[PDB]
Structure 1
Amino acid sequence: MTKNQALRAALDSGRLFTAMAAHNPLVAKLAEQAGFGGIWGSGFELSASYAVPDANILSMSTHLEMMRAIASTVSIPLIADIDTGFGNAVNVHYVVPQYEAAGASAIVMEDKTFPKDTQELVRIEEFQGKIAAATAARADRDFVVIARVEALIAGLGQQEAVRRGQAYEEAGADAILIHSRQKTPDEILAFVKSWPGKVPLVLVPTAYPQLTEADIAALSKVGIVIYGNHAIRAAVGAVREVFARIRRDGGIREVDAALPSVKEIIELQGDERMRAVEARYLK
């Protein structure tokens, strides 16, 4: 079963699929080993690892090559964040095939205008055209196109958010990712209740840690839950703490015992496989 079939099977079966953010292949491997359903190739986490704002500063190829390296490391589906498609429908058309060829099983594209000005969203018809270009360019029909509706964030209201969602589904979107920045999950939950479309919803509840997977499973219309930036946050917290301890203690004497050993990193690099290759082919 291909990774694309696996993703599709999850969406079609009604199971709740979980995806975790990853800013490099090692983190993606740890996510797979932890049991998540898929990897989220987050633009926010990649730009954060590079210490640059998440505002289309990183090159498209830096993200695309990272997607390729992650997909060649894990056996679970990869969902790629392609922001606004790096341009208009023509750019979308040329970019989607490269993400599919890099091994991603899905892309997430949002309806925000690019670049930011001093409208917040692109016209409904313009975005429908971008979604249609994405589904036209894919080679494997199992490849998934997810349209991200930013109407709530833009402060446009629930009625406009549902209208865009329905228009994107009409254009060929396989799932709709709806996002909220409200303090409470009231807004998001009201959208889910009102959602009239046939395709599944995708939530990124980073702003609402109180919404557990059990709470989300209770929402039959949601097919995917994404943990949007927890890997980079976990890494920053531990690195910052270990660096401060080394500088306070003037060394690694107290900190070494608590860290994973060098041998554990070498195993995560796939040393066992390398050992078999060396044993059978280094002659």
Structure 2
Amino acid sequence: EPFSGAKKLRHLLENTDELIVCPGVYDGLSARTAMELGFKSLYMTGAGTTASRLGQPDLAIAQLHDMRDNADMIANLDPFGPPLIADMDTGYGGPIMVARTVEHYIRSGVAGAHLEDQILTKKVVSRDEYLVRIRAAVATKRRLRSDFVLIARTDALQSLGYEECIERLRAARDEGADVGLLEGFRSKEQAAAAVAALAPWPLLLNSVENGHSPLITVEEAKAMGFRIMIFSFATLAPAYAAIRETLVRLRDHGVVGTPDGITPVRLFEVCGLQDAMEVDNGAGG
């Protein structure tokens, strides 16, 4: 029962027809906030992990250690909480590293992850090179007897086109991927078509706030037939805007000016104070 996110996510995917909405989180505060609000699944972003943990742009700076550490932290805030889908980029190396990444994610209670066809160093590797990554990942999840949900992501739309994306996804499905992710749709028509081309194999829609793809609402994605929808930049973007506006006020007016109900104790409560108090009180000292 505890640390069973993979099993939980797989249940949502196989035993329900609901659109699994996963807000993009990147640290403990953002994750705890999504938990407070009752989201049924969370998504740990690579760009957010990089920006927050390393203060760097999303240019393959975060490696396995950074990603696993952030995912291990987020997925286990509540041992009985919502499953976590995490970006696994290209696996951080050759097949040995892809396998290591999947094993570490599995061990860390991560529910699933997306693995792409980009070069590790928008360019994609050959179809065969991509399948080497998928194969390594699937073999690992099978060897570990895990319900881990492997999402096959293809970034080939821009450079190779729609047909190539569909063929790559079909090939990934044959290799054992559980869900497909065609990144960067140019239109809503194209998004609905990818779903129909791969049906009944489930697809995941990646919504990038203020990105280059069209706006698709949760209701629209559900009607299109997607099974999972992740929200990249959903928390990093508003956090930045708020931090910036507040700091400008401090710089120019000499006061922080945050609404008074956002107290240190409220933040501690969002971050697990009650669980800590129960441990402390239960211990009798």
Match of 1:39 in 2: 42
1:236 to 236, 240, 264: 240
Shift of 1:209: 6.0
Shift of 1:95: 1.9
1:269 to 241, 249, 271: 271
Shift of 1:132: 1.7
Match of 2:155 in 1: 150
1:107 to 87, 109, 113: 113
Q: 1:231 to 1:108 in 2, by over 3 A?
A: same
Match of 1:280 in 2: 282
Alignment of 1:1-283 (within 5 A): 2-12=4-14, 13-49=16-52, 50-74=54-78, 75-115=81-121, 120-138=123-141, 139-153=144-158, 155-180=159-184, 182=186, 184-193=187-196, 195-206=197-208, 207=211, 208=213, 210-220=215-225, 222-252=226-256, 255-258=257-260, 260-283=262-285
TM value normalised by structure 2: 0.89
Q: Which moved more, 1:222-231 or 1:135-144?
A: 135-144
Alpha-carbon RMSD = 1.9
Measure the CA separation in 2 of the matches of 1:282 and 1:14. Answer: 47
Number of aligned residue pairs: give it: 274
Shift of 1:259: 5.7
Measure the CA separation in 2 of the matches of 1:36 and 1:268. Answer: 14
Amino acid in the other structure paired with 1:156: L
Shift of 1:212: 0.8
Measure the CA separation in 1 of the matches of 2:114 and 2:236. Answer: 20
Shift of 1:94: 2.0
Give yes or no for contact 1:21–1:230 (8 Å, CA) kept in 2: yes
Shift of 1:38: 1.1
1:63 counterpart SS class = helix
TM value normalised by structure 1: 0.90
Shift of 1:233: 0.3
Q: 1:102 to 1:70 in 2, by over 3 A?
A: same
Q: Which moved more, 1:204-213 or 1:235-244?
A: 204-213
Measure the CA separation in 1 of the matches of 2:189 and 2:207. Answer: 12
Measure the CA separation in 2 of the matches of 1:177 and 1:28. Answer: 23
Give yes or no for contact 1:149–1:179 (8 Å, CA) kept in 2: yes
1:203 counterpart SS class = strand
Q: 1:198 to 1:125 in 2, by over 3 A?
A: farther
Measure the CA separation in 1 of the matches of 2:259 and 2:117. Answer: 48
Measure the CA separation in 2 of the matches of 1:11 and 1:205. Answer: 19
Shift of 1:142: 1.2
Percent identity reads: 28
Q: Which runs of no fewer than 5 residues in structure 1 stay unpaired?
A: none
Measure the CA separation in 1 of the matches of 2:172 and 2:132. Answer: 9
Q: 1:278 to 1:37 in 2, by over 3 A?
A: closer
Measure the CA separation in 1 of the matches of 2:130 and 2:258. Answer: 52
Measure the CA separation in 2 of the matches of 1:229 and 1:196. Answer: 27
